[PDB]
Write an enzyme that holds these catalytic residues in place. Structure first.
Site, PDB file in Angstrom:
ATOM      1  N   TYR A   1       0.866  -1.310   0.127  1.00 64.14           N
ATOM      2  CA  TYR A   1       0.185  -0.145  -0.018  1.00 64.14           C
ATOM      3  C   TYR A   1       1.165   1.192   0.029  1.00 64.14           C
ATOM      4  O   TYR A   1       0.669   2.301  -0.644  1.00 64.14           O
ATOM      5  CB  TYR A   1      -0.855  -0.108   1.182  1.00 64.14           C
TER       6      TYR A   1
ATOM      7  N   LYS B   1       0.609   3.974  -2.655  1.00 60.61           N
ATOM      8  CA  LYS B   1       0.599   5.530  -2.661  1.00 60.61           C
ATOM      9  C   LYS B   1       1.663   6.083  -3.236  1.00 60.61           C
ATOM     10  O   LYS B   1       1.470   7.221  -3.878  1.00 60.61           O
ATOM     11  CB  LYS B   1       0.808   5.570  -0.910  1.00 60.61           C
TER      12      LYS B   1
END
Lengths: 219, 219, 220, 216
Positions: free
Chosen positions: C150, C154
């Site tokens: 993640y 991002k």
């Protein structure tokens, strides 16, 4: 229309001309009353007050040298005396290294930057008194080779960050705006104005600490 | 076979704490050392002796670097002893309560000291003209008081700008940001190692680098 | 004196609940018509549609899995078919210790979901560029502000935002990234993010493309 | 003679990778070089680094192919008995024309390759337990969108690993080359970081463009 709303009050330093005036226009046009500070003479200021007044704002000019700390309290007080409140402060700022003189560092970092930090304190204190507790903003205009200018700029950036954290619980948001190259193609003072008016208008209450690039992406 | 000179480092505030850590690491790795400070004859003796034991020629110079007029004599003394300078190591509340005097001290005066002492050493580095690999290593740190934050940001911006201006000389500029040190923590030896590493020559091409030095607690 | 025009159009991906709905509400109130996409069945969206209509907006819902690249063109065409324009795209989308991370997972998040945002934006952008008066438009990428896949995704999205902003600087299309903190279903509200997006989408920020907006109430 | 620390240099056959392997050999490392290609041109490189004191092997591997990872690490452990340093160096125009296939190759496979190769090496590092200084050094770069995305992913992976491995003795650095630079210039930086003196500087990003990072 049942109930009359205050025009919120903005102090725009150096708001007489250049980016500053682009900012005062946008704020006037978007519903703010305006207090501009500067050292400029009366004849310079008159057509600016007339114009801004045209856009529906009540406008004052306060002739004061913000570099001089003893002028701060009187300047803040002249604003409160005119409008009874302060909602937004716009801190609008305005070579080979081996040639750098302590005179230049003193002026730019020791005096100018100091003036901005402490005027902000003086304004903040009046803001924190009011208690109306609406959405307020402190907007610092920096920019983007003279190292002292780089240092001043960086200091102000850390100033804004630190202030934003300290004010996080208070309803006063702190922002930094970094204008690129502006003519008087290239950017217009209206472009910076629009960004500042956007940030001041309340929609960014939760965005305190943000840094807005204002160079049309040229970076 | 060609004899190489022991390269010369000025470690400001090298007498105690972090400076001493750095001063040891550089000594142990082939540097001659000039330490600056303010302290009496007593606080000096076993330090020069310890560093002499590690293999260095070591001079102490009494200097308040905050005082700009003492700069040129300090540099001249270092040059008079070794004939060259190879490395400069520049080593070492609520906002509503912040006072202009505070700002004057930290931003106004101490940061100014660092910048202009750097300027004085730079001139002497540049004159010697050997053009070999030299380094300027600025030691910083990583709710704090907003004037320290500003001087720290000033220093960081100063490192970057020097790096760029010095990019075509053999002088690399680095910033070391130490975390927390002893009087799972960090040693002054740890900072020393990093600085010795950066000053040893392998980092010529890494100018502008910022080194985190908190054993990764900042993340 | 005061001049009112036809309404611009915003696509809000995942705009059916949470942050997306808070965004769509604010866009509606601030003068936009709205196309909400969602992976889910068109069932239960009627209240929202009726609400946003109370805010003056025409609103459509389009079922689409944006991770599936083949669904992009139809979705974009459906918006254009309904409104004849697209002015704003709001990309709004969605645990281990690293030694135990699995290729399947990385793929799902990095491999697909981020690939989805990238190419969906590409499809919207073609539609935007095919009719442009070089008009005032925007693309707003909503990220976040611990598991490594993640974090990487991002980072990818932030890089995408920067790059796209640079690339689009000649056009009237501004690109922004908005990094929400933690928000309620203390914390902020979906409305705090909505206001920010409505702000970015309103035109005043055309010269500010590439900006990253912190939207965590300054708590990071 | 003392034991020699061991470094894996992915893409170490040539270019910057060779500059790093050359410089790590000279600073006391043995080396394992990884490469997608056949082992043909390798012998010269193996000869040169032996001159610098190092035992060197070449392992043919496509790191984009996850199923090759375990065997590669096993080969390095089999040869050397340890792994002290992994150097992630192996890597490879209008966005309106960007194709999902391009994205998949750069981001969904090659960045994936690095992340997972690192996982496998780290599993071997953590089993050794010797836990003296170790390092993982991620080589990146100082305009095609998927590359920028990949590079940003790698920067972030670098930071996360740094934090996750903080308590271990394995440090994690990112190095960002921009090449008038030489592969020696990058090699020195890496040998400096792999050398121990930076154990407490884990997470650090190093610029490696001679200060054209705000220059040209």
């Amino acid at each position: 229309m049942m109930t009359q709303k205050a025009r919120p009050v903005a102090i725009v330093t150096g708001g007489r001309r250049g980016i500053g005036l682009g900012i005062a226009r946008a704020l006037a046009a978007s519903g703010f009353d305006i207090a501009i500070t500067g050292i400029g003479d009366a004849e310079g200021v008159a057509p600016v007050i007339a114009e801004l007044s045209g856009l529906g704002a009540r406008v004052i000019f306060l002739r004061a040298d913000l570099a001089d700390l003893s002028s701060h309290q009187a300047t803040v007080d002249a604003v409160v005396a005119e409008f009874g409140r302060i909602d937004c402060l716009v801190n609008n700022a305005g070579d080979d290294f081996l040639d750098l003189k302590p005179e230049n560092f003193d002026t730019i970092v020791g005096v100018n930057l100091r003036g901005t930090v402490f005027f902000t304190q003086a304004v903040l204190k009046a803001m924190l008194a009011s208690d109306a507790r609406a959405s307020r903003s402190i907007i610092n205009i920096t920019s983007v080779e003279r190292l002292d200018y780089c240092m001043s700029k960086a200091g102000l950036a850390a100033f804004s960050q630190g202030l934003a954290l300290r004010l996080a619980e208070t309803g006063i948001a702190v922002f930094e705006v970094r204008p690129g190259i502006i003519r008087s193609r290239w950017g217009e003072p209206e472009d910076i104005g629009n960004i500042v008016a956007g940030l001041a208008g309340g929609q960014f209450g939760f965005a305190t600490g943000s840094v807005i690039q204002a160079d049309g992406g040229l970076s």
